[PDB]
Amino acid sequence: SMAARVLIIGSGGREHTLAWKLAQSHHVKQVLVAPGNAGTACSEKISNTAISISDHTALAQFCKEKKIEFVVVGPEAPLAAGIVGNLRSAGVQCFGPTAEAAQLESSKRFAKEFMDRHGIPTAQWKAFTKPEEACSFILSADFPALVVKASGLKGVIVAKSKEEACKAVQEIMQEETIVIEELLDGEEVSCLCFTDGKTVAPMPPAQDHKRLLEGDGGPNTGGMGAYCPAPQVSNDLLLKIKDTVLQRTVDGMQQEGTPYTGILYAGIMLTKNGPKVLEFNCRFGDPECQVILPLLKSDLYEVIQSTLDGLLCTSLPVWLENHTALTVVMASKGYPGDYTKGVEITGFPEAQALGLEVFHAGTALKNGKVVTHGGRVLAVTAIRENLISALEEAKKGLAAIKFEGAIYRKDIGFRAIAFL
Numbered sequence: 001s002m003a004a005r006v007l008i009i010g011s012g013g014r015e016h017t018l019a020w021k022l023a024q025s026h027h028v029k030q031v032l033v034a035p036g037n038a039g040t041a042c043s044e045k046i047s048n049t050a051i052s053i054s055d056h057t058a059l060a061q062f063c064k065e066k067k068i069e070f071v072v073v074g075p076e077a078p079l080a081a082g083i084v085g086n087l088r089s090a091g092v093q094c095f096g097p098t099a100e101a102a103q104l105e106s107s108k109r110f111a112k113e114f115m116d117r118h119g120i121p122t123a124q125w126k127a128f129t130k131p132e133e134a135c136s137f138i139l140s141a142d143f144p145a146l147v148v149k150a151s152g153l154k155g156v157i158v159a160k161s162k163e164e165a166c167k168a169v170q171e172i173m174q175e176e177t178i179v180i181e182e183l184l185d186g187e188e189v190s191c192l193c194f195t196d197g198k199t200v201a202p203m204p205p206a207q208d209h210k211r212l213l214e215g216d217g218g219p220n221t222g223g224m225g226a227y228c229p230a231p232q233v234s235n236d237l238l239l240k241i242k243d244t245v246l247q248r249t250v251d252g253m254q255q256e257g258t259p260y261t262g263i264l265y266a267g268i269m270l271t272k273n274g275p276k277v278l279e280f281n282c283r284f285g286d287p288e289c290q291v292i293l294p295l296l297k298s299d300l301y302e303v304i305q306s307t308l309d310g311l312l313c314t315s316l317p318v319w320l321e322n323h324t325a326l327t328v329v330m331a332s333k334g335y336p337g338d339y340t341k342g343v344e345i346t347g348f349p350e351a352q353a354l355g356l357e358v359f360h361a362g363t364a365l366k367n368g369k370v371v372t373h374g375g376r377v378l379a380v381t382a383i384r385e386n387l388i389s390a391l392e393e394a395k396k397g398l399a400a401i402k403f404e405g406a407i408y409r410k411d412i413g414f415r416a417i418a419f420l
């Protein structure tokens with residue numbers, strides 16, 4: 001099925017990665033990214049479009065006029081806005097869950113209730129709308145009830161003391177419901193799968209670093225780096241997770257008459273008691289996408305097309321084994337607070353020539369130059385035989401790329417390396 005045109009929604013590194021990867025398919029003549037960035041502007045197959053992504057009527061008309069085969073959604077917002085359901089009733093295929101099914105991410109209360117209803121393991125919890133009753137619960141639990149979550153996508157506060165959790169319940173009920181749950185401990189890992197509603201095809205597990213500074217210090221951010229596969233997870237554990245979380249989530253959704261299709265993301269804590277779910281999401285994470293998709297050997301276009309057709313098992317994904325992908329984000333001075341914009345970037349061509357992938361996040365074209373246009377500017381991904389080697393190879397690319405006030409971490413993966 002040659003000469004397909006495909007559309008991706010979004011404008012960060014995740015969307016560059018999806019575009020790059022799709023463009024490799026022999027089935028694909030054109031990838032359009034809406035609105036895209038400087039990394040996707042100007043390629044043999046990839047280009048940007050200013051089509052509105054929030055007016056679903058106009059988006060559908062644009063899809064049919066250009067004969068777009070299907071739409072791929074990068075970020076979570078359009079999913080929760082109904083993009084899939086609306087494109088479908090207009091006769092346009094879109095990869096992703098419906099708004100109803102994205103409730104696994106969009107409402108934390110729904111997710112926790114859904115999990116209790118189907119014996120999916122997760123931290124014990126309770127929801128509140130009055131803050132006084134929330135304090136009562138914090139103050140009188142014998143387990144550490146110290147994690148407070150704004151139900152509607154601060155958002156999440158992990159307190160160390162009852163005092164801090166009461167303080168937190170106060171801040172989140174300023175500017176619905178909140179969920180207070182047990183503080184678990186152990187290792188966090190991201191477990192994704194492709195799913196068509198019935199079949200489940202897990203991705204190899206990833207980990208990322210949210211903290212701004214080396215050593216895991218400073219403020220949290222959207223993610224300063226990631227790598228895949230996380231060596232902390234045995235094969236047994238992955239099949240426990242596939243059975244106990246992924247297949248069980250999809251089956252549960254299907255059995256409640258709200259089938260789940262696209263990507264299911266589960267954030268998981270490895271406890272002494274086993275795997276527990278911290279949160280669901282409905283799309284690739286950023287910068288994890290930048291380390292999972294480079295590991296995919298199959299044609300992504302085939303995987304997606306077969307997922308839309310409900311024939312996921314006819315085209316199971318095949319992964320690169322014995323390779324580790326690791327990615328390191330370059331960010332603008334001041335991130336995650338106020339940062340500078342419009343700063344000229346050099347060296348990303350030589351970084352790629354060294355055999356690395358450069359995935360653009362906040363970049364833009366300006367007067368024949370590429371300039372910073374966002375907090376996270378780009379990521380360099382290396383694919384090698386182990387973490388340590390991938391890290392050091394990525395760092396050569398990082399040293400070639402220069403912009404005024406660039407920051408990045410030189411220790412991505414340090415814990416996985418210490419685990420081994």
Ligand SMILES: Nc1ncnc2c1ncn2[C@@H]1O[C@H](COP(=O)(O)OP(=O)(O)OP(=O)(O)O)[C@@H](O)[C@H]1O
Pocket residue numbers: 123147156157158159181182183184185188218219220267269278
């Ligand atoms: N139920 C849970 N048990 C334990 N950890 C959790 C739970 N749910 C979420 N988390 C994790 O807590 C992490 C964030 O907590 P962290 O220890 O970084 O403190 P923080 O709230 O981020 O503090 P800061 O004010 O510095 O941002 C997230 O990575 C999130 O996945």
Ligand SMILES: [Cl-]
Pocket residue numbers: 081082083084085086097098099100
């Ligand atoms: Cl919908």
